[PDB]
Design a protein around this ligand. Structure first.
Ligand SMILES: [Mg+2]
Ligand SMILES: [Mg+2]
Lengths: 204, 212, 244, 231, 233, 240, 222, 195, 235
């Protein structure tokens, strides 16, 4: 019934020293029924990464939409969109459906190509921006992710340390949520290289 | 209501009852539940209302316009789909309809299409629609063969309506028979259930439960 | 009433021609020459900017060669402003198709769409046609490398090598003479620049009076790269081919 | 000349040529006569045929039980205006349970015809109408021109050679106005009036068309052998 | 769809030999609050018609303006506006009836019960009813709201059928009406003592009586009534 | 919106815009249609003023409306695309509602209806296009060939040509086509179609396109070499 | 909440003879337990030898009758004063009713007259336009009290010929206009006794080739 | 309607779809084919609310057939599935949404690979080795999880499908009157007439 | 230029008068009304021998009791026929009866003047509408683009109209049989046609109360042509 918790899933993003990390589980379900273990919730438009939790048809629709918009942005601007600008675009796009919204919990992550500054942001379904320094959480296990991140996180982590933190935050949160899990992916993002790691986790 | 229609060697038999009720009150015993769309097409009326009357006489207007433009008899497939596409536009509004569009053309042969106010459109060999459909289905299924004679097929349809008219409280009055051939439908009379019941009981030896 | 002042843009002449289309084509004949040449391993787009100034900021300037998506580019001949209206429409169609089918739009489908828009302005609406001719250079996995052209009438055709704008008669003869089917991109680059060098109304062909682009499979493995040449890069290729 | 290309253009002398050309179409049309007394009102119309095989074009149209008109000019325009009258007569009856006054019916026709003369794109109506009726203030006869000018009269005529019938009625004014409670004699005066506009041809059985409305007489049209009595 | 706010109660009326009488009290209630004591609910149209209106007062004021506008419109291009082509009761009613039914059919009714009383051109008595549903009916006696339940029974003892109309004089008819208004004051918890009465006669014309009061009331017997059963003191 | 009446009558009772649309057809490349006993063939001219063309991708002159019907044309190319698109949509719409593909006559009647509508609609000019619509009705082995034109009139033909120098090739067909015995085979029909184009075309190289349509959705376009063999055989017989 | 419908009571009765037709209806108009009018005409002459009554919610009934009468008028204008046949009128009424299929005229409509062969005809309509030609039809409040009586006394249902004992039915002999009017009056007298909404007066309209005639009869006023 | 299954094997896609059509209390038909051929190498099975199912299926069919004629080219199964998803995603926020779930089984002639897509009425697309809609997955997925291999032959796929249907016939309350099975491969679409 | 709905100084609509000139250029169509039926006949006028003449449809059915023949810009008639067929069928749906021939004709003629700056120009086609109803019996109407329609006992429209009408003037009487009318149409068509009349370049049709509207077979018409030749050679 509740659109945001039919399909389930989670996304978490963190900042580190000269790097950001974004991670998601792979589950798509129809309430109790597990349907797919390959439903990735993180997408990217150039060097800007977008995680999207919530209703899966909208996750897909919004990805396709932001691809559409960032492609036209690039053709006209003659440059790739930045995380700060994209965040505003996401907020704009969500609020234009103020009285008929996409049931989603987007999360932006990326490094500004010019300043080199790590950036993360989160939104509610209606477009309100949550720009946190430390971390952003989203999905059916957001309470669990808040609890994990709040205790596990410490500022200025190196990329390979940040990976361990965000991975353990996601995994242990998803294991306390019936509608999350079935695999997980973690992106480690630096100014000019990105490493994508699939995690081994319990498949129930 | 009880309406049936079935394909066989000799074409199509259409049989209907005649009762119309508003709650427990019997409003009419002389209702025509077979629409004569045109001389080659028939439609049944189950569903509760004017909806079948209104929209199937309208269907006759569309079939006439078709053969004026195309200089060719409309197919049973096309005719039934004109109706199903129409009621599908009205889906949700509250139309109440359950009909068999029956016809016999060159390219198709004898054809029956069940059309529904939910938008359902099914081709088939035997259909039964109404509050007394289950009773009619019992007699049909146990006695149906493709190689029935026009005489026996007509009787089977009549007897199947009678079976429903007896048990189903909201069916009865009288039985209307039709026989659809390639050269058009042929009316086979109005049969009062009251008289038909005793006639059938005696001649057939059935309804031994009932005292006559 | 208003009828008195109506030019009636969408009518036939007694001969069966569309006045405005014919006059729009006359307009395009005064525009800078644009050339497209299709090779086996890529496409070349070469185009001449019209009598420029020394104070014109060339590196940020774009009047001839535009990008529709990652696979398809166009060369413009005519009113730049009119072209940009159509270009934005084309860019949107490519994205709509991508959103719908989750596949990059085939070149011909995009070309047909734009050409159909142009056609509409010649048949209805009472507005003047777009005074623009395009050369479409593109690639898809069905037909591979493709060259097209469309004009204000809305008619489009396919080409191995083609010119639009000024001196197309002279340009098309020179291309027809030196073009071959087994030709390569580096050879086509040379032909394109040699053709413009001979057909130009200027005294000499220099880097500041040119826009240049190549669509190559010369991208790392099975994929396609668009290269819009920079002023310094156009200057280099002019020396390499031995024109300056 | 230069000012007759459309209805929206005044001439230098202040004329509307398109309206005057529409007025001309009435003069080309067949003659029709209107006249009334204090009890009854009568329409007499000379119908026109295309040839000997053809029928005679109907000239009289009923608008209500107590109102109707005769036409002269473009028949399709008379059909449009008569239909409009039928609706207004009907609106009055349905909404107000009230028979539409003949004077008010004229006001409506005037205003409808006017809008066609002031706007670009449209054209004036190419027909003249003679509306007769019996309402709460007795018998009435109106003359409608497509310029917009509607005029209440005792008697009149419009169409080709209508001047002859109009002069006759002007002489007979004091006689026919007094024909009260006698429909046949009032029609006779109308048939005698329209006869002044005839040349070469005479009033035959399928040529003549007569309509009447009065105190205890609904608007009824007479054609064929019904008018043989008056020939 | 709305709910009535400021309301007017019963309108009562009856035919007599030469015309019609209509009456209605001068109260504008606000629920149980007897808010407005100076509200005229009989609205004369010309010299031959009086429209009595009960129910929502804001909608009454709207209808009042429609009628005022109707008179203006009727005078336009009408030399006989004060003679043969003057507004009839039957015209005024049919107009209102059309509006009432149209409004109910748009699910946005004028929350009223209206009685049009008048005398026609030919001297005929006109008395017809219409309400928020657009339901219309005519009768020798007509009454709205509580009047329907209490006034009609009394008025029907005077004119029980059509043949009793010529036998009923204006003095007998007015007496019956005034008595009915007293009965309603006794028994209707949303009525007032002050009322207006209108007589439309084919001979003497329209007589409009304002500031009338219910009088000759019986209350003395109340002193003897004590307790609710067993109490003696 | 633009409401101007472009197509209107003249004092002599002519609609010049419809007649000037026919002049655009006269300018267009020649198209020919010949129906045999069990096939129809659509021949089309390709003007050789345009070389360095890419014949793979260049719009072909014959277009499939459905799997069983084809449409060729003469006149404004851009205009033809609009009629083809509408026809293709109507073909699918007919299948969707009637549960049966369009008859060649019906599809023709539709396209002709569109063309007519543009001759008395405000703010639009007529199509500068005449079409040849050919094919076979569903479950029918009788060949069908129809012609339309800007005015909106349409009719059936045993054989017909439209476009530039169509007067000449119609002259040829009128003497060479026998109604009592039409081209019995595919070869005979194609041969007669190529022969008729060779009266006008110039060179029989890449200037002739041939498309053969047979019953039960059997449509195929002939290649250069296949057509070139017909061109060779025709002229070798002619040298006598 | 605003309820756009109401129930004005009343009862109507149509009977088709061999060369005539009658459409009767009581003249009482009511709401709840109150009488609005003891004489409010319900059956109307609509012209062209057709009589009509739309029983139920009086506002919708009056609207429908008004619109049908209007339809007769425009039929004459549009089709050269052609007489509207009873079967054509019936079909026209179906469309008037079905036009408001999703906000119905809350009435049970009956019309009566003569068919094109001069025989008696009665047509019966439900609120949304389903209709049928019938020999006999009571409508409205006391319809359930009248129809069974008519099945028995007009169509001779359940009646058999004495001596045969259920073997031979009573023959369906034709009823005269005087015989029908007796059954109409006894139906309404009986209905008045047992139904509170029926009474005051009975108005019958009789349709023949000669035209429409009216007959009024008193009913009990309690 | 009720049960629709799908399984992608080595060189083909197999779609099973029930034959029963129940309207209320009676089974009106026991031979209903709940599928439409969108293109020569693409098949779509469907289940959902009455009327909407066929109306949608035929609408998609017409659009793909229109594309096939216009371009003289068959769209890839992926492209068709993306088109279908978008229509359903558009549908869900309409005045009256299509209540239709579909499986799109196709063979991509370019990649020489079978492909099975599962799309629900919300527009939720997933590419799968095997899929189902409604309560079908609850019974069958445990068997498919156990037995499925990506390199299965078409004959092995059918045997695994029979085991699924048997489990449905055993444990489901509703009688779905068996299934019509169809195979989609490089040679096109064909029906297994004995099952 | 000038308005489409402009009046000339004589009081005529330019466009309507010009559309009448287009009708004069059209092929001949003839109608003859009798008490046994109404006969409609047309000149097909194929522009080439390769044009399959049976596909030339200038006679058309509107309903079972109403037929129609056309002359002029025949493409314009398709929408008029569509409206007529819809009007006939619609009226039957509303009133459970056949529609009067005059009422049908009036409905068609209402379209005529719906042009301006609605359609952009008048129709360039005239119609001979023939039919039967119970009120006025057998009827023949001539519907123009002016919006006016005349009833006729007999009427010819098209290029040979005034010549044919003069012939119909002499030949028509109120006691014609159907067979006499059939030959009379064939006689007058043959007179005004450029090419020699046969069963392939001319078409006959009729409307009777019993059988309704029927287009004649080329075999049936051929016999009537042969019957005509013999009776003209007979004196
Ligand atoms: Mg689990
Ligand atoms: Mg029963």
């Amino acid at each position: 019934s509740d659109p945001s918790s039919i399909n389930g899933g989670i996304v978490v993003a963190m900042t580190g020293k000269d790097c950001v990390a974004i991670a998601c589980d792979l589950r798509l379900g129809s309430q109790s029924l597990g349907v797919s273990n390959k439903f990735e919730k993180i997408f990217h438009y150039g060097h800007v990464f977008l995680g999207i939790t919530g209703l899966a048809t909208d996750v897909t629709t919004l990805n396709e939409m932001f691809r559409y918009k960032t492609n036209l942005y690039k053709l006209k601007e003659e440059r790739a969109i930045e995380p700060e600008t994209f965040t505003q675009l996401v907020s704009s796009s969500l609020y234009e459906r103020r009285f008929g919204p996409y049931f989603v919990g987007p999360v932006v992550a990326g490094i500004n190509s010019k300043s080199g500054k790590p950036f993360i942001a989160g939104f509610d379904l209606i477009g309100c921006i949550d720009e946190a320094k430390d971390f952003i959480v989203s999905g059916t296990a957001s309470d669990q992710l808040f609890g994990m991140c709040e205790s596990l996180y410490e500022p200025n982590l190196e990329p390979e340390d940040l990976f361990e933190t965000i991975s353990q935050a996601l995994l242990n949160a998803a294991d306390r949520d019936a509608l999350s899990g079935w695999g997980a992916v973690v992106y480690i993002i630096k100014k000019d290289e990105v490493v994508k790691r699939y995690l081994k986790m319990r498949q129930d | 209501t009880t309406t049936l229609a079935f394909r066989f060697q000799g074409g199509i038999i259409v049989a209907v009852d005649s009762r119309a009720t508003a709650g427990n009150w019997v409003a009419s015993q002389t209702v025509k539940k077979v629409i004569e769309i045109n001389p080659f097409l028939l439609g049944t009326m189950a569903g509760g209302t004017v909806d079948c009357q209104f929209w199937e006489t309208w269907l006759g207007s569309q079939c006439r316009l078709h053969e004026l433009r195309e200089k060719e008899r409309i197919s049973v497939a096309a005719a039934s789909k004109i109706l199903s596409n129409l009621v599908y536009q009205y889906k949700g509004a509250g139309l109440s309809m359950g009909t068999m569009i029956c016809g016999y053309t060159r390219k198709e042969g004898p054809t029956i299409y069940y059309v529904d106010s939910d938008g359902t459109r099914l081709k088939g060999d035997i259909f039964c629609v109404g509050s007394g459909q289950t009773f009619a289905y019992g007699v049909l299924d146990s006695n149906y063969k493709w190689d029935l004679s026009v005489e026996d097929a007509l009787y089977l349809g009549k007897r199947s309506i009678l079976a429903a008219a007896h048990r189903d409280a909201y069916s009865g009055g009288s039985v209307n028979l039709y026989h659809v051939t390639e050269d058009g439908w042929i009316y086979h009379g109005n049969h009062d259930v009251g008289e038909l019941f005793w006639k059938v009981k005696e001649e057939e030896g059935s309804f031994n439960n009932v005292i006559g | 009433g208003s009828r008195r002042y109506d030019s009636r843009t969408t009518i036939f002449s007694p001969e069966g021609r569309l006045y405005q289309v014919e006059y729009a084509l006359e307009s395009i004949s005064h525009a800078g020459t644009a050339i497209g040449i299709m090779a086996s391993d890529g496409i070349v787009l070469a185009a001449e900017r019209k009598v420029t100034s020394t104070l014109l900021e060339q590196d940020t300037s774009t009047e001839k060669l535009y990008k529709l998506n990652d696979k398809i580019a166009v060369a413009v001949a005519g009113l730049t402003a009119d072209a940009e209206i159509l270009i934005n429409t084309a860019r949107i169609h490519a994205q709509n198709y991508l959103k719908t089918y989750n596949e990059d739009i085939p070149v011909e489908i995009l070309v047909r769409r734009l050409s159909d828009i142009k056609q509409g302005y010649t048949q209805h609406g009472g507005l003047r046609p777009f005074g623009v001719s395009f050369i479409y250079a593109g690639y898809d996995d069905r037909y591979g490398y493709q060259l097209y052209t469309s004009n204000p009438s809305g008619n489009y055709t396919g080409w191995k090598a083609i010119s639009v704008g000024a001196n197309t008669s002279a340009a098309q003869t020179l291309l027809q003479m030196d073009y071959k089917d087994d030709m390569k991109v580096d050879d086509a680059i040379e032909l394109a620049l040699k053709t413009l060098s001979k057909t130009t109304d200027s005294s000499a062909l220099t880097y500041d009076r040119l826009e240049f682009a190549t669509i190559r499979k010369g991208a790392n493995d099975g994929e396609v790269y668009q290269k819009i040449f920079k002023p310094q890069e156009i200057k280099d290729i002019l020396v390499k081919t031995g024109i300056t | 000349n230069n000012y007759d290309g459309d209805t929206v253009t005044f001439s230098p002398t202040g004329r509307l040529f398109q309206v005057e050309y529409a007025l001309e179409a009435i003069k080309q049309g067949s003659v029709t006569v209107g006249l009334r007394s204090n009890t009854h009102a009568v329409l007499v119309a000379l119908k026109r045929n295309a040839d000997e095989l053809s029928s005679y074009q109907k000239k009289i149209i009923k608008c209500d039980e107590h109102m109707g008109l005769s036409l002269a000019g473009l028949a399709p325009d008379a059909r449009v205006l008569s239909n409009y009258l039928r609706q207004q007569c009907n609106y009055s009856s349905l909404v107000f349970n009230r028979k539409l006054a003949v004077e008010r019916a004229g006001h409506l026709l005037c205003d409808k015809a006017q809008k066609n003369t002031q706007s670009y794109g449209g054209r004036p109506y190419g027909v003249g109408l003679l509306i007769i009726g019996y309402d709460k203030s007795g018998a009435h006869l109106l003359e409608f021109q497509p310029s917009g000018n509607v005029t209440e009269l005792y008697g009149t005529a419009i169409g080709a050679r209508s001047q002859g019938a109009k002069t006759y009625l002007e002489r007979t004014l004091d006689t026919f106005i007094k024909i009260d409670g006698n429909p046949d004699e009032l029609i006779k005066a109308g048939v005698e009036a329209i006869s002044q506009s005839l040349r070469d041809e005479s009033l035959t059985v399928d040529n003549l068309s007569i309509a009447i409305v009065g105190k205890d007489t609904p608007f009824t049209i007479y054609d064929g052998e019904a008018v043989a009595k008056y020939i | 769809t709305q709910q009535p706010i400021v309301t007017g109660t019963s309108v009562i009326s009856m035919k007599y030999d030469n015309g019609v009488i209509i009456a209605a009290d001068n109260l504008g209630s606000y629920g149980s609050l007897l808010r407005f004591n100076g509200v005229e609910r009989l609205i004369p149209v010309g010299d031959n018609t009086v429209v009595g209106i009960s129910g929502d007062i804001s909608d009454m004021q709207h209808i009042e303006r429609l009628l005022k506008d109707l008179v203006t419109e009727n005078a336009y291009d009408n030399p006989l506006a004060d003679a043969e082509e003057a507004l009839e009761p039957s015209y005024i009613f049919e107009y209102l009836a059309t509006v009432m039914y149209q409004r109910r059919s748009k699910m946005n009714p004028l929350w009223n019960a209206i009685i049009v009383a008048g005398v026609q051109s030919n001297g005929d008595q006109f008395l017809r009813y219409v309400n928020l549903l657009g339901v219309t009916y005519s009768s020798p006696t007509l009454a709205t709201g509580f009047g329907a339940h209490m006034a009609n029974p009394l008025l029907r003892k005077v004119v029980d059928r059509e043949s009793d109309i010529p036998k009923t004089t204006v003095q007998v008819a007015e007496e019956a009406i005034v008595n009915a208004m007293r009965v309603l004051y006794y028994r209707d918890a949303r009525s007032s003592r002050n009322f207006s009465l209108a007589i439309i006669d084919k001979n003497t014309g329209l007589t409009f009586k304002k500031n009338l009061q219910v009088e000759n009331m019986k209350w003395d017997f109340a002193k003897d009534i004590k307790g609710y059963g067993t109490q003696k003191i | 919106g633009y409401d101007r009446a472009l197509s209107i009558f003249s004092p002599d009772g002519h609609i010049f815009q419809v007649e000037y649309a026919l002049e655009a057809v006269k300018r267009g490349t020649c198209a020919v249609g010949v129906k045999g006993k069990n096939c129809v063939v659509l021949g089309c001219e390709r003007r050789s003023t345009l070389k360095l063309q890419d014949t793979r991708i260049t719009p072909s002159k014959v277009s499939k409306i459905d799997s069983h019907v084809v449409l060729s044309f003469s006149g404004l190319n851009a205009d033809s695309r609009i009629l083809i698109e509408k026809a293709r949509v109507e073909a699918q719409s007919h299948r969707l509602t009637l549960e049966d593909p369009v008859t060649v006559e019906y599809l023709t009647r539709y396209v002709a209806g569109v063309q007519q509508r543009y001759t008395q609609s405000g703010g639009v000019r007529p199509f500068g296009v005449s079409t040849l619509i050919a094919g076979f009705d569903p479950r029918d082995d009788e060949p069908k060939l129809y012609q339309t034109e800007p005015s909106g009139i349409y009719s059936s033909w045993s054989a017909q040509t439209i476009g530039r120098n169509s007067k000449t090739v119609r002259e040829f067909l009128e003497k060479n086509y026998d109604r009592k015995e039409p081209p019995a085979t595919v070869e005979e029909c194609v041969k007669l179609t190529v022969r008729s184009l060779l009266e006008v075309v110039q060179t029989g190289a890449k200037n002739i396109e041939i498309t053969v349509v047979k019953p039960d959705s059997d449509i195929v376009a002939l290649s250069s070499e296949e057509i070139n063999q017909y061109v060779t055989q025709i002229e070798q017989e002619k040298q006598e | 909440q605003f309820n756009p419908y109401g129930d004005n009571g009343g009862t109507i009765l149509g009977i088709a003879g061999e060369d005539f037709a009658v459409l009767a209806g009581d003249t009482r108009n009511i709401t709840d337990y109150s009488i609005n009018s003891r004489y409010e005409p319900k059956v109307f002459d609509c012209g062209d030898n057709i009589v009509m009554s739309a029983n139920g919610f009086a506002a919708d009934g009056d609207a429908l009758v008004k619109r049908f009468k209007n339809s007769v008028k425009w039929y004459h204008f549009d089709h050269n004063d052609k007489k509207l046949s009873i079967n054509s009128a019936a079909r026209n009424i179906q469309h008037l009713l079905y036009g408001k299929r999703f906000f119905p005229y809350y009435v049970h409509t009956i019309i009566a007259g003569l068919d094109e062969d001069g025989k008696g005809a009665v047509y019966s309509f439900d609120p949304v336009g389903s209709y049928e030609r019938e020999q006999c039809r009571a409508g409205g409040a006391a319809a359930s009290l009248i129809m069974p009586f008519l099945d028995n006394q007009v169509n001779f249902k359940n009646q058999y010929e004495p001596g045969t004992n259920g073997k031979v039915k009573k023959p369906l002999k034709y009823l005269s206009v005087e015989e029908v009017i007796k059954l109409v009056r006894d139906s309404f007298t009986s209905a008045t006794e047992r139904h509170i909404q029926v009474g005051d007066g009975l108005e019958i309209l009789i349709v023949t080739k000669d035209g429409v005639r009216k007959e009024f009869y008193e009913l009990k006023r309690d | 309607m009720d049960i629709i299954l799908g399984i992608r094997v080595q060189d083909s896609v197999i779609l099973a779809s029930s034959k029963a059509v129940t309207r209320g209390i009676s089974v009106l038909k026991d031979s209903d084919d709940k599928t439409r051929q969108l293109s020569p190498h693409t098949l779509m099975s469907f289940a959902g609310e009455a009327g909407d199912t066929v109306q949608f299926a035929e609408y998609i069919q017409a659009n793909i057939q229109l594309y096939s004629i216009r371009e003289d080219y068959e769209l890839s199964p992926q492209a068709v599935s993306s088109f279908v998803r978008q229509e359903l995603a558009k549908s869900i926020r309409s005045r009256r949404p299509y209540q239709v779930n579909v499986l799109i089984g196709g063979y991509d002639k370019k990649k020489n690979k079978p492909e099975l897509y599962q799309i629900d009425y919300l527009g939720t697309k997933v590419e799968l080795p095997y899929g189902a809609h409604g309560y079908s997955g609850f019974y069958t997925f445990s068997l498919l999880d156990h037995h499925y291999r990506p390199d299965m032959t078409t004959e092995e796929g059918l045997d695994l499908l029979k085991l699924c249907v048997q489990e449905l016939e055993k444990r489901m309350p509703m009688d779905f009157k068996g299934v019509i099975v169809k195979i989609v491969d490089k040679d096109g679409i064909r029906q297994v007439d004995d099952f | 230029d000038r308005g489409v709905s402009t009046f000339s100084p004589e009081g005529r609509l330019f466009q309507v008068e010009y559309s009448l000139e287009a009708i004069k250029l059209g092929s001949t169509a003839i109608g003859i009304a009798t008490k046994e039926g109404v006969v409609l006949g047309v000149e097909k006028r194929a522009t080439s021998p390769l044009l399959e003449s049976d596909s030339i449809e200038k006679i058309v059915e509107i309903d079972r009791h109403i037929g129609c023949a056309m002359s002029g810009l025949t493409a314009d008639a398709r929408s008029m026929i569509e409206h007529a067929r819809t009007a006939a069928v619609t009226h039957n749906l509303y009133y459970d009866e056949d529609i009067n021939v005059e009422s049908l004709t009036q409905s068609v003629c209402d379209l005529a003047l719906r042009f301006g700056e609605l359609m952009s120009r008048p129709f360039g086609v005239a119609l001979l509408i023939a039919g039967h109803d119970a009120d006025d019996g057998y009827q023949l109407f001539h519907a123009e683009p002016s919006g006016t329609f005349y009833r006729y006992n007999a009427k010819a429209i098209g290029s040979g109209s005034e010549g044919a009408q003069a012939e119909l003037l002499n030949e028509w009487h109120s006691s014609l049989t159907l067979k006499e009318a059939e030959l009379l149409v064939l006689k007058i068509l043959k007179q005004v046609m450029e090419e020699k009349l046969d069963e392939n370049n001319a078409q006959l049709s009729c409307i009777t109360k019993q059988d309704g509207f029927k287009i004649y077979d080329n075999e049936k018409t051929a016999e009537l042509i042969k019957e005509l030749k013999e009776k003209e050679a007979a004196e």
